[PDB]
Amino acid sequence: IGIRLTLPPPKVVDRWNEKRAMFGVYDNIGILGNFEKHPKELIRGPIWLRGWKGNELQRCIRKRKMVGSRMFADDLHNLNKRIRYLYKHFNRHGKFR
């Protein structure tokens, strides 16, 4: 019980597909391009997560302040509740003071 009685199907990985064979290209565009472009501008992803990093609390304010007006009603309510809980936990709880 709790373990499979047969071997899982073997997995095949293409180490030389288009994405793997050219990962990291243009990451030094700023150094080698007279600083006309920043490697941060190559970041592809969420609007509030482009060239920025922070803890869970900080990510919630940044999402709310930038795209909060466009979120769904249920999602906005949950995001507001998450900020309230995170604010209480970080500013009032912990081993260290």
């Binding site: 373990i3 499979r4 009685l5 047969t6 071997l7 899982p8």
Partner: peptide, 26 residues
Amino acid sequence: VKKGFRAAFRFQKELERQRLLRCPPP
């Protein structure tokens, strides 16, 4: 179903050892 291969591989060797002990070859 839990993703992973080593645990299943180890289990297969253990079963084969039991199968070998169940009816040892001449």
